[PDB]
Design a protein around this nucleic acid. Structure first.
Ligand SMILES: N=C(NCCSC[C@H]1O[C@@H](n2cnc3c(NCCCc4ccccc4)ncnc32)[C@H](O)[C@@H]1O)NCC1CCCCC1
Ligand SMILES: [K+]
Ligand SMILES: [K+]
Ligand SMILES: [K+]
Length: 544
DNA sequence: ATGGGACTTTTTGA
DNA sequence: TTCAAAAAGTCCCA
């Protein structure tokens, strides 16, 4: 979890580069999760040069005996650097590092606190705040602790929110008037549904100076997280425009230049501005070309998928190894075919059509009692009885030990519907003809009856799989890792759709693609030509 | 050994 | 009663 030095230097320089040390020689710089002091040790170096370069001006303007170069080390540690961390071994190491910057005279007091930053009663605000807070999601966070966050941090922490939301809140709350904060956190709060309250909190309490979005790039080696750097202030400012630096190529190595600023100004990043006053509850962080593109589509389309469709998440068995068998597995001979459903994974979804299924789900909810079908329970499902019994609804009695945890409603699956993978590099919406069941890695919707005469499944997969809609969706989608976006209903169902003079031709092209994709000898190339023709029709329709 | 690519479970709050 | 969100993802190889 060590933050790379090139990022640490940038965040520290972002806050202190324009500090007027003559006007205020007592700046308070805080790291609320300082660890071993990746940031604070750099703050010390930057402060020391700042004081030494102006030592004679300070000696003249202020106590001429206090301001000597020999006194800078003590002054920094007594009045300027503040750290907090829950790990006492980390604080003990940082205290030793800060002491070793000078190399007892008299007992220098360092402002390091071993505590929970979210619980500490903070006695004063701070001029500058930097660091890299902990990230802990809803599954890994201790349940007794979550009761505390839901009580005391409800303005940013609810439901499936993350712990680092609370650090944004704490950092903002203890930032002095006119102060500057700069942190590196996961990027997901910029787009996620859970981050809505946090985005409202940031926008309405600080001026966001700058957002560095690394998208799917791997900033932390051997860590599966996607990062951003937020810089914000509480200055009295009227313009309130955000500098947004979005990475262009996710495969870039971060150390190509001596400094991060060189990387940002390079061709490896795009820069654009966003008006903070124009931010809705969603933050549309795109350049002017993309904003025009996005707005054209939004205004043109009179419907959304949510308007015309019923959406639902897939089956959640609660223990897949207990209920999912290969269709060639001999144990399926014990299971009556009335209990067996086709099962697909996200990899089975292509554009327009689903691979033939290779797995079967035992829809165990339809097993009436333990004595009629003893063989299935003893020889297939019962091999995982202990794990099945530990599921939440089994411990509370709502589920029998052999039942599916969230079996949903079979009738929603056993119908013509559209399916798409929950995480993908591109739009892949397929028409399911085979009553496929799936887990939560595949989402489904079917068309409401009253919209069937306006929209057909064949038309919908045509436009949703188009190049236009792939770009259109990815503008506001949640970037997860390198070449992975979330395709979840909370954004997929917000996709807006249109219907105009090109409807018949778009639908016809979609059927030709479906027909070719289902044939034995597939000449995939003609599909690409048809898709290009369809994309041109869609661009003609939307005026782009 | 590492960094990069394929692929994606069930726990959980509401 | 029962929905859907959540990557400090997870796992493997060359
Ligand atoms: N794998 C992880 N990676 C991220 C590392 S974060 C970097 C620094 O952040 C400090 N740090 C964290 N949480 C703090 C905090 N309050 C929140 C407390 C939340 C909590 C509640 C119950 C049980 C445990 C934690 N207050 C001040 N410092 C804090 C670390 O000690 C570290 O040196 N975190 C999970 C896990 C492991 C480290 C101990 C606890 C987190
Ligand atoms: K003086
Ligand atoms: K990443
Ligand atoms: K992992």
């Amino acid at each position: 979890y060590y933050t790379p030095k090139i990022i640490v230097d940038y965040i520290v320089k972002k806050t202190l580069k324009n500090h007027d040390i003559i006007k205020n020689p007592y700046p308070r710089i805080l790291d609320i999760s300082c660890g071993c002091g990746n940031f604070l040790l750099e703050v010390y170096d930057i402060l020391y040069d700042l004081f030494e370069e102006n030592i004679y001006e300070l000696k003249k303007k202020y106590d001429e005996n206090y301001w000597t170069v020999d006194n800078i080390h003590r002054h920094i540690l007594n009045y300027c650097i503040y750290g907090a961390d829950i790990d006492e071994k980390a604080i003990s190491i940082l205290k030793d590092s800060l002491t070793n910057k000078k190399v007892d005279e008299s007992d220098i007091k360092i402002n390091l606190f071993c505590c929970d930053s979210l619980k500490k009663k903070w006695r004063y605000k701070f001029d500058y705040i930097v660091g890299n807070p902990p990230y802990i999601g809803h599954k890994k966070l201790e349940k007794k602790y979550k009761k505390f966050l839901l009580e005391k941090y409800s303005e940013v922490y609810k439901d499936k929110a993350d712990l680092y939301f609370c650090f944004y809140k704490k950092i903002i709350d203890i930032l002095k008037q006119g102060g500057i904060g700069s942190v590196i956190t996961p990027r997901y709060f910029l787009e996620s549904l859970s981050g809505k309250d946090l985005r409202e909190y940031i926008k309405s309490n600080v001026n966001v100076q700058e957002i560095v979005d690394f998208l799917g790039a791997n900033i932390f080696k051997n860590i599966g997280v996607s990062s951003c750097i937020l810089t914000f202030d509480k200055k009295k400012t009227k313009e309130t425009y955000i500098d947004v630096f979005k990475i262009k190529n996710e495969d870039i190595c971060i150390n190509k230049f001596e400094t991060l600023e060189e990387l940002l100004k390079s061709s490896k990043f795009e820069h654009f501005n966003i008006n903070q006053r124009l931010l809705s509850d969603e933050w549309i962080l795109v350049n002017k070309d993309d904003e025009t593109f996005y707005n054209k589509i939004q205004e043109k389309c009179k419907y959304s998928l949510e308007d015309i469709a019923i959406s639902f998440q897939g089956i959640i068995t609660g223990c897949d190894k207990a209920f999912i068998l290969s269709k060639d597995d001999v144990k399926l001979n014990l299971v009556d075919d009335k209990f067996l459903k086709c099962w697909i994974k996200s990899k089975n979804i292509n554009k327009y059509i689903v691979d033939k299924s290779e797995y079967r789900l035992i829809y165990s909810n339809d097993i009436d009692n333990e004595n009629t079908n003893k063989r299935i329970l003893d020889e297939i499902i019962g091999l995982y009885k202990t794990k099945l019994e530990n599921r939440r609804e089994c411990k509370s009695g709502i589920r029998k030990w052999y039942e599916l945890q969230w079996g949903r409603e079979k009738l929603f699956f056993e119908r013509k519907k559209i399916m798409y993978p929950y995480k993908s590099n591109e739009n892949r919406f397929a028409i399911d003809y085979d009553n496929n069941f799936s887990s939560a890695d595949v989402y489904s919707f079917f068309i409401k009856e009253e919209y069937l005469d306006k929209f057909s499944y064949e038309y919908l997969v045509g436009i949703l799989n188009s190049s236009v809609y792939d770009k259109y969706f990815k503008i506001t989608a949640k970037k997860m890792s390198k070449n992975i976006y979330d395709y979840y209903p909370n954004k997929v169902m917000k996709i807006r759709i249109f219907r105009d003079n090109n409807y018949e031709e778009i639908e016809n092209l979609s059927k030709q693609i479906i027909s070719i994709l289902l044939n034995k000898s597939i000449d995939k190339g003609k599909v690409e030509k048809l898709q290009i023709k369809m994309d041109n029709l869609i661009m003609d329709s939307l005026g782009i």
